[PDB]
Amino acid sequence: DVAKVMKTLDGMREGLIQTAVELGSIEAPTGREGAAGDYVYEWMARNGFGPERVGVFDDRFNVVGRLRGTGGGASLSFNSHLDTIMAREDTARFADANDRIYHEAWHEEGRIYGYSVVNCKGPMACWLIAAKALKEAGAALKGDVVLTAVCGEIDCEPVDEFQGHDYLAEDIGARYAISHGAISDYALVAEATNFKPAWVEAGKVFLKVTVFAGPSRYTPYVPRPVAALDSPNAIVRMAKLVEALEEWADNYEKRYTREYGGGTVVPKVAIGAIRGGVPYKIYRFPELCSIYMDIRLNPDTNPLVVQREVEAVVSKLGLKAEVKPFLFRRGYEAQGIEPLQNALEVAHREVVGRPTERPGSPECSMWRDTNPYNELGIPSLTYGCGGGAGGGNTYFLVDDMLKAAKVYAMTAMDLCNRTP
Amino acid sequence: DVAKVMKTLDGMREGLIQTAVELGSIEAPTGREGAAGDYVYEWMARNGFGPERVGVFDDRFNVVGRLRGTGGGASLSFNSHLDTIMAREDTARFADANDRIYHEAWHEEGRIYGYSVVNCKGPMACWLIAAKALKEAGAALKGDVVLTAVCGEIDCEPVDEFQGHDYLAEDIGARYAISHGAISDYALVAEATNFKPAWVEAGKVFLKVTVFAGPSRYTPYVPRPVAALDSPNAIVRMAKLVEALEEWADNYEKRYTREYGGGTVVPKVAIGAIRGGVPYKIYRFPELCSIYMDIRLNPDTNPLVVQREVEAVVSKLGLKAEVKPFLFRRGYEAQGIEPLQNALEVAHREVVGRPTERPGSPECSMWRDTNPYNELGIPSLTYGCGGGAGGGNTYFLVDDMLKAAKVYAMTAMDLCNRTP
Ligand SMILES: Nc1ccc([N+](=O)[O-])cc1C(=O)O
């Protein structure tokens, strides 16, 4: 069998690239994934995978389709996300929000370009094609192959005045699709891991640290000189608190590094946002300033601890602040992952030509949709071509992309013909 | 301390009753919890718990407020749900959809009447008041008391053409509130358990069993006689398939009963809805009919197994059908429950007057929002007065409700002054 499907895949090298660019071209930042979902649904429908739209919202939804199998075999889920990182105008976070790389996809040489291709339509293109090859090559599987394309993968979260349809992400994402029928025995989340598989990822907790000072004064009355930490202007104390927290962050990752069978989890910290006062009434400095922190957790850390740590860092400075968490997610290590691990490995060795190696710590210390599957007892690991977008890589090598498709296919033929 | 708060609660017995009826009277079936959330938000705000609205939709949201503590202590979460079971016009499921009991609440004697009070504003009223007592009695707590009132508790799930805002429930419910900041060291879910605490609850999986027959014929051409199982009318084969599944259902609970520390899980089965063809074009019998089954799971059952079981029940009749699951949730047993269990137990003995006993199997075999807390590592158990609405009880005794408020208060006083 395996030789039939392999030759078949070489048949669709063009189809592989096209699907990637066509998908890559669609503007699909988190919050506008609908357009891409429609493309995949049609693509899936067109190929007889009989898709369904699972979603909280009618313009933000997941697509679940499946390649039915003869019967009595393990079922494997293939997963990737619809949304992309950069919106068309994200001038807040990028110095150059207009680079072509951020919002398009193209074939400039035996490689494919576009942040929207690396994350994450390139991998999705791969298993979409791999499923096509099996069906068209009429391969024999006893188990179903489930094709899950999800939305809201990326870590956008509502906070404060940003609530609802536009800001939601992972709550309406893969975990929704699963809890509403996209279940299988094992699941392979396809993302760029550089052909290295990982069965651990990290949780996270988001803290909104607000520091209090005051009292506000009309600028002609502001009192100086005063020590930074005793400033009445909360932006100034925040300045100090930011630098203390930056050192805490430096140590946090070292202390909480944990090595797992699945990978080595090095959980980092970052201050994603800050805001105090409003730009259109600055005549009075603000009595409070806020920062938004992204703290990663290894699978074994309780977020309440981390809050208390950050609470402590604040107390050491004699500041008065409110540390409040507005997001908490858990990271998991796969249990019972072996069958999929093994199936993947044989395929990998056959195609790539060498054993799989330990993934880099960053690839095991982030959020990937393996956590929802593992959360619900569907053993999951992540594996794909290219290097991580957060790295960040900007292209894929079509040969690599073609290899990944073979591995996905072979993994399926292997695993799906084993009885659970 | 404990006596100060106890005398205080007798101070607010009427407020206890008023709060329940006022809350019970609000029409708040799942899908319209908005009016009630607003009520609680203002109630919470009026009393200084500084509430916040956590929700996916602006008319369906959870309310989280908290009674701040001095510092360096464990924090305890109190939880109850806003929604009620029966909508004002639910003529589809109830023979008398107009009974006063289904949609209102009233104080007719030392007891309070109303399905909306038993499930679930009676308990919510209890701890809302308990929080009031502590604050008003200036009791000493080192840790926060978190007041979480949620929506989408009840098992309404979107399916088929019923998707979106109106049909969503627990996905936007408590698990949303927690994943977005309503975290504590421990959590107590207040519902009617008959003053027996349980820290295990059951999962569930929903299957849409669709059976195919045919071919369609205009009534004057329908062929008879034919055996039931060979009928062209898909409603007829379904009649046979329903009785097979009913016998499978009788056995399922016996085979899968499991005993846990938190309780004994007896997982039942039920066929909640059926529909084949449409009432406004009956001249042609339908080539397919569907039933929607609600299958509970003990925490250790894999939803994939139960599907194969039912797929089997179909295959044994030689029927061709499509068994597809459209909901899957997991049931959990609490881990690390001891501190709450004990804190609860001491209060119970003092107020109720005797040791606590094992809960009834139904109360451990359902869905309660303890599963979301436990899923995310917050040990949780459920305890409240009265007997379960699913039973279904139709009233609460004002005395028992007052006791339950005393227990909640005492639990908080104990637990919140322990350091984690
Ligand atoms: N899961 C991810 C989420 C976000 C980003 N990013 O760089 O914005 C990358 C990945 C990834 O898979 O590499």
Ligand SMILES: Nc1ccc([N+](=O)[O-])cc1C(=O)O
């Ligand atoms: N959590 C529940 C959900 C539904 C129902 N019901 O009878 O429809 C009852 C309860 C309960 O708590 O007893």
